[PDB]
């Protein structure tokens, strides 16, 4: 029955594999990536008419009927996104008259105009002189003086925010303006009677920071700022030291762009870092068949390859398949062997993790590491020396990464400070990197393959963490995936792997939750709205991946030979395409809960294959 499906899905993945032996699916997000690219080019005075065109088609192609842009397909119109996308188009050529500009503008105004958008948006506009810098949350270069163990030192922030903060401090230090030609001036963004509904700090605004900011804006106006020169040079050095191998910073769009602006501001357009940083960009670009051009927020080569292997293995292929070996070998060359920002908290810990992208040695994440090691542990490579060796280094790194509560974070240890969550600046997505369930699950599932059970104290500490975090309805939050279906599936799958008894009450209470949300079409679905409104927890159009996740939670809990179980398998078997793939018009990936959603291209293929492979296992 399903054998034909799996067989097809298998061959299909094998075709999607690159020559070097790795997998790499485009990472989808929203148009603020492209819109900001447009402004960046304008700032750096490097505009390519041909590129602008591809970006225009794309932007438009993504705008919806109502004339707006959302964070995820089928999501509500987003102000910020729409505003930036608006400015982008108007700069490329679009006249405020045209239908698109019209419908978009309307929505903008009906929301309070520019005054209701996130700091980033207002800041970008400030950069081109369409918004007063004085009304922008200030982040001083002096922040570079806070010691390792001080309130708000750059190391209390999450790896991604840290790099951005450092870069911007330089920018906000000079408050530069790169005037847009009259043709693209966007005054209309202000024309509105609707009361400006401004968004506040993530965890709440304390009158202290509220005032402190005002203080900084005043100090900003003085004629002399002692030691500021040395604060900037510190930020500069700091950035120069961590520029990733591909010329990017952290392998993400944000700090990368800002860092370049920071360099341009310091007349360093002749310096190597800038050059490399600039040309590095092309790698993240993607030529769309319909003539459009999108820019990836980040790239997932490692991740994809890692999961890809696991899937194919659980599917059936030999642990020494010549094709999987290509992957195995490739992965080994990717392992990071040098200290990264994490070292600040673990000086005596030996390097051994992995990164999300191709070359980003200073920021390996616990997630990728776990999956990569585990995936390697399932293979038979020619050089059993390096395979054995690497795994150990990766293993130990992870161990030494375990936070205080036994749960694992993404990039750092105990990065749980609650201070930065109140700064006027941080009003978008996460700013700290505390342990999450999904990550910790992938970790446990990693050790599990080696054989380490609940006996080992490490494991227990984690399980305790998971038990404590479980939601009332037996579900588990999805931090880097959408959502409860993602988390729950992760956990149950992990716990089952670490020897825990699947018969336990809290476990069963989870499985039941799964069955209770299975959509009529046989599959499972969870819309991103589940982050905003709880009524959507486990609700939404059925998707290949999300279905495959819930399917794993069931196969893991022994309920593999069940109704809901077989029902779901049917969905996958049916919905599958003639080529063996699968479609998924929705996002099942999460950047930040409620603020940034991602669509992992491979998920629709890899996970369904992994699930079917595991179903074919239970029989």
Residues of the shown chain interacting with ligand C8E in the complex, contacts defined by CB under 6 A:
229, 232-233, 236, 241-242, 266, 339-341, 343-344, 362
- Collapsing DSSP to helix, strand or coil, 354 comes out as strand
Half-sphere exposure of 360 (CA within 13 A, CB side): 25
- Residues 234, 123: Cα–Cα separation, whole Å: 23
The closest of 422, 433, 513, 506 to 470, measured between CA atoms, is 506
Residue 297 interacting with ligand R79 (CB under 6 A) = yes
- Residues 110, 95: Cα–Cα separation, whole Å: 20
Q: Cβ 99 to its own copies, closest distance in Å?
A: 45
- Residues 441, 497: Cα–Cα separation, whole Å: 10
Segment contacting its own copies by CB under 8 A, of 45-53, 148-156, 267-275, 486-494: 267-275
Among 77, 306, 407, 429, binds ligand R79 (CB under 6 A): 429
Residue 303 interacting with ligand R79 (CB under 6 A) = yes
367 is catalytic: yes
Active-site pick, 246, 304, 365, 367: 367
- Count the residues in the chain: 619
- Distance linking the first and last C-alpha atoms of the chain: 13
Residue 349 interacting with its own copies (CB under 8 A) = no
Binding site partner of 344, from its own copies, ligand R79, ligand C8E, none, Cβ cut-off 5-8 A by kind: ligand C8E
CA distances, 501 to each of 137, 496, 524, 559 (Å): 51, 7, 25, 13
Q: Cβ 237 to ligand C8E, closest distance in Å?
A: 9
Binding site partner of 340, from ligand R79, ligand C8E, its own copies, none, Cβ cut-off 5-8 A by kind: ligand C8E
Q: Which is nearer to ligand C8E, 81 or 360 (CB)?
A: 360
98 and 406 in contact (C-beta within 8 Å)?
no
Residue 243 interacting with its own copies (CB under 8 A) = yes
Q: Which of residues 30-59 bind ligand R79 (CB under 6 A)?
A: none
Residue 333 interacting with its own copies (CB under 8 A) = no
- Collapsing DSSP to helix, strand or coil, 496 comes out as helix
- Residues 91, 185: Cα–Cα separation, whole Å: 8
Residue 332 interacting with its own copies (CB under 8 A) = no
Among 114, 361, 528, 569, binds its own copies (CB under 8 A): 361
Q: Which is nearer to ligand R79, 5 or 493 (CB)?
A: 493
- Residues 45, 309: Cα–Cα separation, whole Å: 43
186 and 130 in contact (C-beta within 8 Å)?
yes
Give the other-Cβ count within 10 Å of 426's Cβ. 23
Residue 160 interacting with ligand R79 (CB under 6 A) = yes
Residue 201 interacting with ligand R79 (CB under 6 A) = no
Q: Which is nearer to its own copies, 319 or 343 (CB)?
A: 343
CA distances, 72 to each of 55, 139, 303, 461, 523 (Å): 19, 30, 21, 36, 20
- Residues 550, 548: Cα–Cα separation, whole Å: 6
CA distances, 460 to each of 267, 452, 502 (Å): 54, 11, 15
Q: Cβ 472 to ligand R79, closest distance in Å?
A: 26
Q: Which of residues 463-502 bind ligand R79 (CB under 6 A)?
A: 480
- Collapsing DSSP to helix, strand or coil, 481 comes out as strand
Q: Cβ 296 to ligand C8E, closest distance in Å?
A: 24
Among 94, 161, 263, 573, binds ligand R79 (CB under 6 A): 161
The residues carrying an active-site annotation are 367
Q: Which parts of this chain interact with ligand R79 (CB under 6 A)?
A: 160-161, 164, 252, 254, 297-298, 303, 356, 365, 367-368, 410, 426, 428-429, 431, 480, 591, 596
Q: Which parts of this chain interact with its own copies (CB under 8 A)?
A: 233, 236-237, 240-241, 243-245, 247, 267-268, 270-273, 275-276, 337-339, 359, 361
């Amino acid at each position: 029955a399903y054998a034909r499906t799996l067989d097809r899905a298998v061959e299909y993945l094998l075709s999607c594999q690159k020559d070097e032996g790795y997998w790499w699916g485009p990472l989808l997000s929203n148009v603020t990536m492209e819109a900001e690219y447009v402004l960046l080019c304008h700032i750096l005075d490097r505009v390519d008419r041909d590129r602008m065109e591809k970006i225009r088609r794309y932007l438009l192609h993504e705008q919806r009927e109502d004339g707006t842009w959302a964070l995820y397909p089928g999501g509500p119109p987003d102000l910020d996104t729409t505003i930036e996308a608006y400015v982008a188009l108007k700069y490329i050529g679009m006249s405020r008259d045209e239908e698109p500009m019209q419908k978009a503008l309307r929505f903008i105004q009906s929301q309070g105009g520019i005054e209701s958008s996130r700091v980033f948006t207002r800041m970008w506009l400030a950069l081109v002189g369409e918004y007063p810098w004085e009304k922008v949350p200030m982040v001083p270069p002096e922040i570079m003086f806070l010691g390792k163990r001080m309130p708000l030192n750059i190391y209390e922030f999450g790896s991604w925010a840290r790099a951005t903060v450092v870069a911007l401090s330089i920018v906000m230090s000079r408050q530069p303006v790169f005037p847009l030609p009259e043709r693209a001036r966007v005054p209309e963004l202000y024309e509105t009677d609707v009361p400006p509904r401004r968004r506040g700090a993530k965890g709440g605004g304390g009158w202290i920071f509220d005032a402190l900011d005002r203080a900084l804006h005043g100090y900003q106006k003085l004629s002399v700022h002692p030691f500021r020169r040395a604060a900037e040079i510190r930020a500069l050095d700091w950035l120069l030291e961590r520029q990733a191998g591909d010329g990017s910073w952290g392998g993400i769009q944000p700090p990368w762009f800002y860092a370049l602006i920071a360099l341009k501001i310091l007349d360093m357009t002749q310096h190597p870092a800038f050059i490399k940083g600039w040309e590095g960009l092309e790698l993240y670009g993607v030529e769309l068949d319909y003539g459009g051009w999108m820019f990836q927020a980040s790239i997932s080569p490692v991740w994809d390859t890692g999961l890809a292997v696991l899937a194919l293995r659980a599917a059936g292929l030999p642990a020494d398949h010549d094709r999987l070996v290509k992957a195995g070998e490739w992965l080994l060359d990717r392992q990071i062997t040098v200290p990264g920002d994490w070292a600040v908290k673990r000086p005596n810990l030996k390097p051994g993790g992995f990164a999300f992208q191709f070359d980003n040695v200073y920021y390996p994440d616990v997630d990728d590491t776990a999956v990569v090691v585990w995936a390697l542990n399932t293979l038979r490579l020619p050089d059993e020396r390096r395979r054995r060796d690497a795994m150990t280094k990766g293993f130990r790194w992870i161990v030494g990464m375990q936070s205080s509560n036994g749960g694992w974070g993404a990039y750092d240890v105990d990065n749980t400070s609650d201070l930065p969550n109140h700064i006027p600046f941080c009003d978008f997505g996460e700013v700290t990197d505390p342990p999450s369930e999904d990550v910790t699950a992938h970790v446990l599932e990693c050790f599990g393959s080696f054989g380490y059970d609940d006996a080992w104290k490490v494991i227990r500490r984690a399980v305790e963490y998971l038990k404590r975090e479980q939601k009332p309805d037996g579900s588990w939050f999805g931090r880097w995936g959408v959502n409860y279906l993602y988390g729950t599936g992760a956990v149950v799958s992990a716990l089952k792997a670490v020897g825990i008894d699947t018969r336990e009450p809290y476990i069963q209470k989870a499985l039941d939750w799964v069955e209770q949300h299975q959509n009529p079409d046989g599959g499972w679905g969870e819309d991103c709205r589940s982050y905003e409104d709880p009524a959507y927890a486990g609700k939404g159009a059925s998707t290949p991946s999300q279905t495959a996740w819930a399917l794993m939670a069931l196969i893991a809990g022994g309920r593999a030979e069940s109704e809901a179980a077989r029902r779901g398998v049917q969905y996958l078997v049916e919905t599958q395409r003639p080529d063996g793939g699968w479609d998924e018009p929705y996002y099942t990936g999460t950047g930040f809960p409620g603020d940034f959603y991602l669509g992992y291209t491979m998920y629709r293929h890899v996970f369904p294959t992994l699930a079917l492979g595991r179903y074919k296992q239970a029989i």
